[PDB]
Amino acid sequence: GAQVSTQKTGAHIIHYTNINYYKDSASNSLNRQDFTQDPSKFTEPVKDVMIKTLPAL
């Protein structure tokens, strides 16, 4: 039940092991490595699509 995952490294021996010790999922560590996002709920929440090159009106 060991989860070997990728460590946070830079860009131009890179793995860590995790064992879960407790029977509750609230006892687990933080989910540091989850970087998913979609900003279209806030920046472009209009009904008809608005292409950049075309005039807005």
Q: In the complex, what is the shortest distance from the CB of residue 15 to other proteins, in angstroms, rounded to a whole number?
A: 13
Which residue's CB is nearer to a second copy, number 18 or number 50? 18
Q: Are 27 and 18 in contact (CB under 8 A)?
A: no
User: Considering the rule CB under 8 A, would residue 3 count as an interface residue with other proteins?
Assistant: no
Q: Give the CA-trace dihedral at 36, 40, 42, 47, to 10 degrees.
A: -150
Q: Which helix (H) or strand (E) holds 5?
A: strand 3-6
**Residue 24 C-beta: closest distance to a second copy, Å:** 5
Chain residues in the site for a second copy (CB under 8 A)? 1-5, 7-10, 13-17, 19-25, 28, 32-33
